[PDB]
Design an enzyme around this catalytic site. Structure first.
Site, PDB file in Angstrom:
ATOM      1  N   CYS A 163      -1.709  10.232  -6.634  1.00  0.00           N
ATOM      2  CA  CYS A 163      -2.924  10.126  -5.800  1.00  0.00           C
ATOM      3  C   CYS A 163      -3.984  11.209  -6.060  1.00  0.00           C
ATOM      4  CB  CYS A 163      -2.586  10.092  -4.306  1.00  0.00           C
ATOM      5  SG  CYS A 163      -4.051   9.961  -3.244  1.00  0.00           S
ATOM      6  N   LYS A 170       0.814  -1.222   0.000  1.00  0.00           N
ATOM      7  CA  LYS A 170       0.000   0.000   0.000  1.00  0.00           C
ATOM      8  C   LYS A 170       0.848   1.273   0.000  1.00  0.00           C
ATOM      9  CE  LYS A 170      -3.181   3.143   0.611  1.00  0.00           C
ATOM     10  NZ  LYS A 170      -4.218   3.419  -0.433  1.00  0.00           N
TER      11      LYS A 170
HETATM   12  C1  LIG Z   1      -9.564   1.028  -3.004  1.00  0.00           C
HETATM   13  C2  LIG Z   1      -8.416   1.494  -3.864  1.00  0.00           C
HETATM   14  C3  LIG Z   1      -7.235   1.914  -3.264  1.00  0.00           C
HETATM   15  C4  LIG Z   1      -6.177   2.342  -4.059  1.00  0.00           C
HETATM   16  N1  LIG Z   1      -5.031   2.766  -3.486  1.00  0.00           N
HETATM   17  C5  LIG Z   1      -3.974   3.138  -4.243  1.00  0.00           C
HETATM   18  C6  LIG Z   1      -2.666   3.523  -3.674  1.00  0.00           C
HETATM   19  O1  LIG Z   1      -2.469   3.450  -2.445  1.00  0.00           O
HETATM   20  N2  LIG Z   1      -1.681   3.869  -4.520  1.00  0.00           N
HETATM   21  C7  LIG Z   1      -1.843   3.910  -5.850  1.00  0.00           C
HETATM   22  O2  LIG Z   1      -0.874   4.223  -6.580  1.00  0.00           O
HETATM   23  N3  LIG Z   1      -3.010   3.591  -6.449  1.00  0.00           N
HETATM   24  C8  LIG Z   1      -4.077   3.222  -5.718  1.00  0.00           C
HETATM   25  N4  LIG Z   1      -5.276   2.852  -6.331  1.00  0.00           N
HETATM   26  C9  LIG Z   1      -5.382   2.888  -7.791  1.00  0.00           C
HETATM   27  C10 LIG Z   1      -5.080   1.500  -8.320  1.00  0.00           C
HETATM   28  O3  LIG Z   1      -3.716   1.213  -8.001  1.00  0.00           O
HETATM   29  C11 LIG Z   1      -5.259   1.462  -9.825  1.00  0.00           C
HETATM   30  O4  LIG Z   1      -4.331   2.396 -10.388  1.00  0.00           O
HETATM   31  C12 LIG Z   1      -6.677   1.832 -10.256  1.00  0.00           C
HETATM   32  O5  LIG Z   1      -7.643   1.268  -9.354  1.00  0.00           O
HETATM   33  C13 LIG Z   1      -6.942   1.323 -11.673  1.00  0.00           C
HETATM   34  O6  LIG Z   1      -6.899  -0.105 -11.764  1.00  0.00           O
HETATM   35  P1  LIG Z   1      -8.251  -0.995 -11.829  1.00  0.00           P
HETATM   36  O7  LIG Z   1      -9.041  -0.514 -13.014  1.00  0.00           O
HETATM   37  O8  LIG Z   1      -7.654  -2.371 -11.906  1.00  0.00           O
HETATM   38  O9  LIG Z   1      -8.978  -0.714 -10.526  1.00  0.00           O
HETATM   39  C14 LIG Z   1      -6.336   2.381  -5.538  1.00  0.00           C
HETATM   40  C15 LIG Z   1      -7.516   1.968  -6.139  1.00  0.00           C
HETATM   41  C16 LIG Z   1      -8.569   1.539  -5.343  1.00  0.00           C
HETATM   42  C17 LIG Z   1      -9.857   1.110  -5.994  1.00  0.00           C
END
Ligand SMILES: Cc1cc2nc3c(=O)[nH]c(=O)nc-3n(C[C@H](O)[C@H](O)[C@H](O)COP(=O)(O)O)c2cc1C
Ligand SMILES: Cc1cc2nc3c(=O)[nH]c(=O)nc-3n(C[C@H](O)[C@H](O)[C@H](O)COP(=O)(O)O)c2cc1C
Ligand SMILES: *C(=S)Nc1ccc([N+](=O)[O-])cc1
Ligand SMILES: *C(=S)Nc1ccc([N+](=O)[O-])cc1
Lengths: 313, 313
Positions: free
Chosen positions: A132, A45
């Site tokens: 972020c 995370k």
């Molecule tokens: C609940 C949640 C928490 C996330 N936390 C982070 C994070 O701590 N750092 C980060 O770079 N991206 C974070 N993301 C973004 C994901 O890493 C990813 O870039 C984004 O969800 C797109 O991928 P997906 O379409 O597979 O969800 C988070 C996404 C979600 C849904």
């Protein structure tokens, strides 16, 4: 006769799949579960120097076409993830990435100074989050090119290892060009992860006539099926513009076919967020099976045979 | 007991629906068909000073979740649309918007100078396009805040009427704030249309291992289901930040329920692109019926009762 093996940064990966930072990687239990999964790797995370409780709940909502969130960097703090990398992670099982998201340039510099020794001793790899979209009042560093150059300079000065950067999506060739030019100035930036969420969407539930998350008046990052073409665009744009680097795909992966598309666009590793949140780490068994199935039907034995080979018209 | 009537810009509209600029509004036949439809209004294809063939084909592809396109401003030229507004349009049937997309400040200035008299005499309303994401080598004007300010200053200086601006999506509160600050400096900008396509997505067909449109290596604007939460976010963001102006919604409308969401977010008019491209102008009879059905089930009689009333948590 087939293989999902990926070789990069002095490491071997059994397959290209890993979690997306933020999903199923905050606690010890989650990190162990990711390590025990069929994934090729994992990333912890995104961390801040100290623990953060994150934004008020509800802060995540699953949707028919994906997800919306405004988590606000809830995390156990850098010391916790550094300790996991230094003392607990079983590198014999798979390589480990550590995601870092300091709330200032100085915060990242100070964490990097301390991460250096653990990267040297144990081999953990940094993924620096420049994107972020959910912490109130905080700018998207990667949408500020001057700031981005300064931060990568500051990190490069104190961090004696290769690392990668997690990027927000761009939507214009001028931005792709500007961002790529900056990243190409830093030889230590060996991989680019495309993409973080599509920022600040607004989901409204017609039945309740309301937003669905509490923070920031309901505005939050979009993930899942909504983001796949945007993710493919960013993966391919940077694959083309940064030939000296690897690209990690992230966004919209639910199936082996989606993963195939990421790789065709240029991806080396493929990160899974929303789909993993909804299904749990068992998803990696399914995804490896499906990707091999897709490859078998298409008569491909390895990922290098089609990585970045998307055909244009 | 119910009404979809909208009153704005010194005009009365039977309902909030109209086409999105660029969809079914290029030819005389299309403009007549839109005028004869159940829509509340219509807008002509974004025009350049001279006729333009646009980009190579294929340049549009319908998708399960929406559409991708790189049309490249194919249009009959400003004279054609000015002549339609001046001599052919039946203002007795509904009001008319004319979309303008000059490829430089000078081009817009020159067209506006000629438009002025027709707006005065006939009542056509300008929608100035600051967002087209498909002209090779020319980035979105509204992604360059200095270019945006200088375009609006020029048009305001030479055009003696209120007008509106078609905006690309933003994804960061800093950008919503910056754009709104600029728009608020121009009292002639009386409406803001949110949004144009999500720019430069990349659709890859897994079966053909190729992109699906020819221009710009397959990169094109996304419309349809993909863009609804981004559209709602932009509609609401500008509804909140530009209280002196009207917001027109555009993006992801396929049903009366989708339209209801646009209005809840703050929309006065609701534009329909991808869904209209796929269904034809008969869609407006369906959309008015569905929106009234949604309002009936919810016990709303008029749009004023819920416009911009989305509940936050
Ligand atoms: C609940 C949640 C928490 C996330 N936390 C982070 C994070 O701590 N750092 C980060 O770079 N991206 C974070 N993301 C973004 C994901 O890493 C990813 O870039 C984004 O969800 C797109 O991928 P997906 O379409 O597979 O969800 C988070 C996404 C979600 C849904
Ligand atoms: C084929 C096509 C042509 C378009 N042409 C224009 C244009 O000339 N001017 C403009 O402002 N937007 C244009 N757009 C964008 C639409 O007006 C609209 O902003 C976008 O498609 C999102 O709405 P939708 O989700 O209903 O498709 C076009 C979109 C499509 C698909
Ligand atoms: C560059 S890494 N500096 C930086 C990091 C994080 C923030 N922030 O508060 O979002 C700003 C600047
Ligand atoms: C603003 S009035 N004029 C304008 C139109 C188009 C561009 N462009 O970048 O192609 C710039 C300025």
């Amino acid at each position: 006769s087939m293989s999902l093996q990926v070789n990069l940064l002095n490491n071997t990966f059994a397959n290209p799949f890993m979690n997306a930072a933020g999903v199923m990687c905050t606690t010890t239990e989650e990190l162990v579960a990711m390590t025990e999964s069929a994934s090729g790797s994992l990333v912890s995370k995104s961390c801040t120097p100290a623990l953060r409780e994150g934004n008020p709940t509800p802060r995540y909502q699953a949707l028919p076409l994906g997800s919306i969130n405004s988590m606000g960097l809830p995390n156990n703090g850098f010391d916790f993830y550094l300790a996991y990398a230094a003392e607990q992670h079983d590198y014999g099982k798979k390589p480990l990435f550590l995601s870092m998201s300091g709330l200032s340039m100085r915060e990242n510099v100070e964490m990097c100074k301390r991460l250096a020794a653990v990267a040297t001793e144990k081999g953990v790899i940094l993924e620096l989050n420049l994107s972020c979209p959910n912490v109130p009042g905080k700018p998207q560093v990667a949408y500020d090119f001057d700031a981005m150059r300064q931060c990568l300079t500051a990190v490069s000065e104190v961090y004696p290892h290769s690392f990668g950067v997690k990027m927000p999506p761009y939507f214009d060739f001028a931005h792709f060009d500007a961002a790529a030019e900056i990243l190409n100035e830093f030889p230590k930036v060996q991989f680019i992860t495309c993409i973080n969420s599509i920022g600040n969407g607004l989901v409204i539930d017609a039945e309740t006539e309301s937003v669905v998350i509490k923070p920031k008046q309901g505005f939050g990052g979009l993930g899942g099926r909504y983001v796949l073409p945007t993710a493919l665009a960013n993966i391919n744009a940077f694959y083309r513009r940064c030939p000296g680097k690897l690209i990690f795909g992230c966004g919209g992966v639910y199936t082996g076919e989606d993963a195939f598309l990421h790789v065709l666009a240029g991806a080396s590793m493929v990160q899974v967020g929303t789909a993993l949140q909804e299904e749990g780490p068992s998803i990696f068994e399914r995804l490896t099976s499906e990707l091999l199935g897709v490859m078998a039907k298409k008569r491909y034995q390895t990922l290098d045979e089609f990585r970045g080979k998307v055909r244009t018209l």
